[PDB]
């Protein structure tokens, strides 16, 4: 239900999960997720332009191998080569791994200390000292480097993070 609409709209397509959602340049509103092997272009994960609009991409999202493990997604940048598109996007898994993807190219995997990661945010922290800040259901958390997918600190009990 949107403000500007005020109506209960149903999603036409039949998905399992909506690992990510949000606004992108040129598109207005978007959901990642799936419907129902080592080729980058296979991907197993439908974009969907919201309001029963186009699937929009089945081309350069993460491989289907990862599709069995990934629990959460967090996009970091969206470029458009032609009608197609190119997203560089972070995932994380039930197997305590944090992965980078560039056009669905698995690059820069790290292995997390703790179990059942929930979410990730991005911390700027000056010039290029960029950290991915990972939460867990276990009420603990990681701050992992960018540049080098490498654990910097891993605190515990952490009622909340901001």
């Amino acid at each position: 239900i949107s403000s500007q609409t005020g109506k209960v709209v149903s999603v036409s397509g039949n998905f399992s999960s909506i690992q990510w959602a949000g606004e992108i340049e040129n598109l207005g509103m978007v959901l990642l997720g799936l419907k129902e092997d080592y080729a980058i272009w296979n991907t197993k994960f439908c974009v969907y332009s919201l309001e029963s609009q186009e699937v929009l991409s089945d081309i350069y999202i993460i491989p289907p191998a990862y599709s069995s493990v990934v629990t959460y997604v967090h996009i970091c940048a969206t470029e458009i080569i032609k009608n197609q598109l190119r997203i560089s996007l972070i995932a994380l898994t039930r197997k305590n791994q944090l992965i980078s993807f560039q056009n669905g190219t698995p690059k820069n995997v790290c292995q997390l200390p703790f179990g059942d990661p929930c979410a990730v945010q991005l911390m700027d922290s000056g010039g290029g000292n960029l950290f991915f800040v990972v939460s867990f259901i276990s009420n603990n958390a990681c701050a992992v480097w960018k540049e080098s997918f490498q654990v910097a600190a891993k605190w515990e009990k952490l009622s909340l993070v901001l």
Binding site: Y38, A65, S68, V109
Partner: protein
């Protein structure tokens, strides 16, 4: 993507052989402990996948290179290498429990099913 991991293996093995042939006492161990961590990270990335029949002949390759290079630099073995081998074999089985002796019994019957990675198994 197998190609990428394969490429990485290739690259780092060649880098290790280069350190083996060329290099000074410090620079040798520098490139070696570089390749070591390359192979660690690769291991962890592949250990992040479920099973993958086509991956195992690589993973086992990788673990073998890892252990060798590990043990070669240590100039000696450890029990982490037993656990490494433990993990590799357990992975082999979890495609298709108790301890190394019964694992190997079940493993080698699992190899008499004829998956073509015996080259690796016999190296293990």
């Amino acid at each position: 993507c197998l190609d990428l991991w394969r490429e990485k293996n290739d690259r780092l093995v060649r880098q290790a052989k280069v350190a083996q042939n060329s290099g000074l006492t410090l620079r040798r161990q520098q490139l070696a402990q570089d390749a070591l961590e390359g192979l660690r990270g690769l291991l962890h990335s592949l250990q992040g996948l479920p099973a993958a029949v086509p991956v195992l002949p690589l993973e086992l390759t990788v673990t073998c290179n890892f252990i060798i290079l590990r043990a070669s630099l240590a100039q000696g073995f450890t029990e982490d290498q037993a656990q490494d081998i433990q993990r590799s074999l357990e992975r082999v089985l979890e495609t298709q429990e108790q301890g190394l002796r019964e694992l190997w019994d079940s493993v080698l019957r699992a190899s008499c099913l004829l998956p073509e990675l015996l080259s690796a198994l016999h190296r293990l």
